[PDB]
From Swiss-Prot, chains A, B:
Has 2 lobes, each of which has an 8-strand beta barrel flanked on their N-terminus by a 4-strand handle domain. TbpB stabilizes the TF holo C-terminal lobe's conformation. The gene is tbpB. It is a lipid-anchor. One of its GO terms (cellular component) is cell surface. Binds only human holo-transferrin (TF), via the TF C-terminus. Forms a large complex with TbpA and TF. Interacts via its C-terminal domain with Slam1. It holds the Pfam family TbpB_C. Residues 23-49, 156-182 are annotated as: Disordered. Keywords: Cell outer membrane, Lipoprotein, Membrane, Palmitate, Receptor, Signal, Virulence. This is Transferrin-binding protein B.
Length: 514, 514
């Protein structure tokens, strides 16, 4: 979707002051909150935790949270419990009532959040095969006067009416979360998720169930899931398994959702997080799942090349070339005209960014400066390896940002004109062969082999030295890159030297046509 | 405002089915309904009456209405009770409850409307002086759970909560409407209005009060009113006299309104109607007032000239040149390009209209046909007599629609070009003198005296006959017209002959400039 490390949704409490009563408080897409990057996924998300810390109590000040979270119920899919990258769950307080009679506000009930968050969003995934993910899921409901969800939460405290139904409520007493052993057909403890991810076809399906207390089949299914995978993200729908027919509907899971979204985390996407909001705005869900406890394709490139030390770091990215993720904050690259330039301060003081180009849509590259640090960056969404064209002669044209020196330093931005930085590449896909040239003043020569949706080769200053306007002699510099966008219209790469002349360069070119 | 013969607003009933309850139902500008032209203002408005006739009852089928309406309380401002042109009031049924349990709807309480409507919206008003108007007013409220208005309506039946508070409720028991005599300081019986209309300054003020039951001053004021008069209409604000300060507000009249609108009715605007909706959407008000029971300026021209019988009828108009009112329905003249043409069918089958012109803004004229009848029409908003310029030489240019015959008939639409219908006028305001010429084929000559914002004179074919492309001899034909728009930029007139050649003509011209 619009990408992020995580999302949280707060419980609602309904005003029941007589004469100024809200009959209902619905959930809204706008209610979703970003969590930010967690240092430790097992801990509560910091922004929302701080909110709850300040929530007033009167008799019980503790924060209660999902049992596997960092402060004897269980909530886990057996064989799939050792999360390292992604956590979902809930936390709350027995919040004091708001009793503001002269402003006509009375509110009572728990206050808290459901959430998921993760670290290390994936840049590679299995190339093929169907893989089973299991884990947990959580929910929070709207509030409506007279409403109860007695099938899921015993309504002695007006859960669903005065404050949201949620999966952490003390009266959620129909799951097996407190039992000591499992029935033969239980998937685990409490509310659990089961997803089948088809990396071959870039899609996934799943089921969200409750494992039922034993006091006849022991689970109940509330949703099935369907989603398309794009890069490290996925988007789709949730289908309510029991909606309204012969029943008056004793639970909140009665409407489909068209807003299922999530993403993969970890080295090869072995964990995932997701959320959705029901179309009738009655229920929000978050969840997490992982491969069983213990060949790849690359879906994106996102790198930072630091000048001062010529070093190259991987950046996080949510499979969106136009969204630059640095230091856990998200910097957009298009203003909701070749190249571009601007600065940005969140909430390092400010970020200065120069980005190219206007004609590129799956690939962005340029300059990044913190304040003072300076780096180049490149990020792109790789084309599916199965979409790599077979054409034997393909020309790409564009530019590049350059920083090089054997004595004094030369720096040159990218440009469309005139004798400024220019790049050209000819690719023989059939041969798995790639070559091209970068010129400043009319010089590097690059040979490489294509592998899947990526390439790898060398860049040399040739013979001998370059200019510095003193000869810089770079030869056998490792060059890595990729093809971005559908059907590989855009391509990009970078190189650092060494692995008395230095060099750091990002470049990107666009495909032509007869 | 947007003009009309009248407006009605329906009572609300709030859904109190448990679990599917509306905590409130607010009023909305969109809730206003047009009443249409009444044949007899003393009768209920027909559209809304038909709605209430179909409202289901179970034990009491009668329609109850304001005492002065055509089916022993009184509702009247003493000395101002003999309405002939405008009525306001209410009507309702003790409606059966809606008890639809499987669709989760329970509604109970009265159902009905408040309204005003009038006939003969005024084309003349007193030229000057402040005049006292008095009459009645009525209200309907929103509904909100736990809300009561015990100061105005004894809340035994949840008035204001389950169904709207309204001035016709059987528990409105604090006014003197049932008493047999009046205290010295009562303005009359029930809820009454008092307006001071300043025709000299084109503005008005007023007060809406309740005359209180006697069981210390005997009236209570709930609103003051302020409005600007434009033509036969007025627009402005209502100010809540008691809003919220030291009180918890036992009545609904707590918010100002910025949507006061109304108009004058009768030969010289001796009666008026008005409405407003409070800004907090809690209360709607309608009302009516008249001069005491028993020199003018003309604010608009609106005429229909029927071909077949060369006769000229006055049209109703709400001081809006772009809104054509015929047969009680409203036909717009601008499509939410000189001249224009189109047809229109409401809800005579359809109306065919040709209207001129695109450059005129306070004046419209052209052809009107019913289906088959055919007429010309002209309508304009007169400039205030005090805004009549003093300039001694002023040229106006435009066109005219023409229909004439001594044997065979000649008809010619208006146009900007070329040798087609053209009109030119020179006006000496200082002299109160006006002249001009209409030409078809390069002919009428018009002399006239200006009086206030109108003129009057003669049109002649001169010497001798005209063409018919047979000579048509028209001389001494009475011509009447006016100056329209602010500062008299536009002017218009018409003539019918006679009071073997006939003639019917509408024309309009626009002012030039150095």
């Amino acid at each position: 979707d619009q990408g992020g490390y995580g999302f949280a949704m707060r419980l609602k409490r309904r005003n029941w002051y007589p004469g100024a009563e809200e009959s209902e408080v619905k959930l809204n897409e706008s209610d979703w909150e970003a969590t930010g990057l967690p240092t430790k996924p097992k801990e509560l998300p910091k922004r929302q935790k701080s909110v709850i810390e300040k929530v007033e109590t009167d008799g019980d000040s503790d924060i209660y949270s999902s049992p596997y979270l960092t402060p004897q119920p269980k909530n886990q899919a057996t064989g799939h419990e050792n999360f390292q990258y992604v956590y979902s769950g809930w936390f709350y307080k027995h919040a004091a009532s708001e009793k503001d009679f002269s402003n006509k506000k009375i509110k009572s009930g728990d206050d808290g959040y459901i959430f998921y968050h993760g670290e290390k969003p994936s840049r590679q995934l299995p190339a093929s095969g169907k893989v089973i993910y299991k884990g947990v899921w959580h929910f929070v409901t709207d509030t409506k006067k007279g409403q109860d969800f007695r099938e899921i939460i015993q309504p002695s405290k007006k859960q669903g009416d005065r404050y949201s139904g949620f999966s952490g409520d003390g009266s959620e007493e129909y799951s097996n979360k407190n039992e000591s052993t499992l029935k033969d057909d239980h998937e685990g403890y409490g509310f659990t998720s089961n997803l089948e991810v088809d990396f071959g076809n870039k899609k996934l399906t799943g089921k969200l169930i409750r494992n039922n207390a034993s006091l006849d089949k022991h689970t109940t299914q509330y949703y099935s899931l369907d989603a398309q995978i794009t890069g490290n993200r996925f988007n789709g729908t949730a289908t309510a398994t029991d909606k309204k027919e012969n029943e008056t509907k004793l639970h909140p899971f009665v409407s489909d959702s068209s807003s299922l979204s999530g993403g993969f985390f970890g080295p090869q996407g072995e964990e995932l997080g997701f959320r959705f909001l029901s179309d009738d705005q009655k229920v929000a869900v978050v969840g997490s799942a992982k491969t069983k406890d213990k060949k790849l394709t690359t879906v994106l490139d996102a790198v930072e090349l630091t000048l001062n030390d010529k070093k190259i770091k991987n950046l996080d990215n949510f499979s969106n070339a136009a969204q630059l993720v640095v230091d856990g904050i998200m910097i957009p690259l298009l203003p909701k005209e070749f190249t571009r330039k601007f600065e940005h301060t969140p909430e390092t003081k400010t970020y200065e960014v120069e980005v190219c180009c206007s004609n590129l849509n799956y690939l962005k590259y340029g300059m990044l400066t913190r304040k003072v640090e300076q780096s180049m960056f490149l990020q792109g969404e790789r084309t599916d390896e199965k979409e790599i064209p077979t054409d034997q002669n393909v020309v790409y044209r564009g530019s590049w940002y350059g920083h090089i020196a054997n004595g004094t330093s030369w720096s040159g931005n990218a440009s469309d004109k005139e004798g400024g930085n220019r790049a050209e590449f000819t690719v023989n896909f059939a041969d798995k062969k790639i070559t091209g040239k970068l010129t400043a003043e009319n010089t590097f020569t690059i040979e490489g082999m294509i592998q899947g949706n990526g390439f790898e080769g060398t860049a040399k200053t040739a013979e001998s030295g370059f200019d510095l306007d003193p000869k810089a002699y770079i030869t056998d510099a490792k060059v890595k890159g990729g093809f971005y966008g559908p059907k590989a219209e855009e391509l990009g790469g970078w190189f650092a030297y060494p692995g008395a002349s230095s060099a750091t360069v990002v470049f990107g070119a666009k495909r032509q046509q007869p």
